[PDB]
Structure 1
Amino acid sequence: VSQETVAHVKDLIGQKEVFVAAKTYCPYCKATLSTLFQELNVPKSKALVLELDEMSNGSEIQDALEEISGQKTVPNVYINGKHIGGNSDLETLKKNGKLAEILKPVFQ
């Protein structure tokens, strides 16, 4: 993956306060999105969700994402331009109480 693609994906990542790279027919992508938007009431106007398998450039976005973080799996979550991880990481932070404070400024 090119440095220009890498830079573009970083730009995508930091546009909105919540970023999720997901795919359709992905059980834990669904779980992640439900946690964020249905359980925790994150305003969708403050989020960018990419469905990579719907995007003609979906495959290179994912490669760029792996380059940036080393994560190969979806969902891939960033909050405030900072890498959260996948559904397992999100769930850890949810149970920790850390997620609520992480999201605090999204409700700002």
Structure 2
Amino acid sequence: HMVSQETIKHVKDLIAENEIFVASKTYCPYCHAALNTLFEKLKVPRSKVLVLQLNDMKEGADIQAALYEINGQRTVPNIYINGKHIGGNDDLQELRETGELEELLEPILA
């Protein structure tokens, strides 16, 4: 219970309001891997995805701490698709490999 309810609600809002939400950082190899998969490989429209660079926001550490409380993950990339917690790049690639990611992205690509 490290973070304010204000921050928890704000992060929950970002998760709910955006088709895809990706918590990221600048110069983050695995963040780059996940975004390259989404935008370049799978051609998800960039305008449908909210990407935040935590290290460059005042509220950055606060947002990261909120995500830890919400989903138990402490690292970036931290991905949500259609309100559902995906995880990091490992998780995204695993869903891709089974064919699940295709079905998760379908309603969004429409």
For the criterion TM > 0.5, the same-fold answer is yes
Shorter-normalised TM range: over 0.9
Q: Provide the aligned C-alpha RMSD in A.
A: 0.7
| Residue 87 (structure 2) pairs with residue 80 (structure 1) | no
| Residue 69 (structure 2) pairs with residue 67 (structure 1) | yes
Structure 2 spans left out of the alignment, 5+ residues: none
Match of 1:46 among 45, 48, 54: 48
For these two proteins, the number of residue pairs brought into alignment is 108
| Runs of 4+ in structure 1 over 3 Å off | none
Deviations 1:34-64 (A, max 9, x none): 0011110111111100000111111000000
Q: Counterpart in 2 of 1:20? A: 22
Letter in 2 for 1:46: K
Measure, in 2, the Cα distance between the counterparts of 1:44 and 1:23.
17
Measure, in 2, the Cα distance between the counterparts of 1:15 and 1:48.
10
Q: Counterpart in 1 of 2:39? A: 37
| Residue 71 (structure 2) pairs with residue 104 (structure 1) | no
Instruction: Report sequence identity in percent.
Output: 63
What TM-score comes out, normalization by structure 2 length? 0.95
Q: Counterpart in 2 of 1:4? A: 6
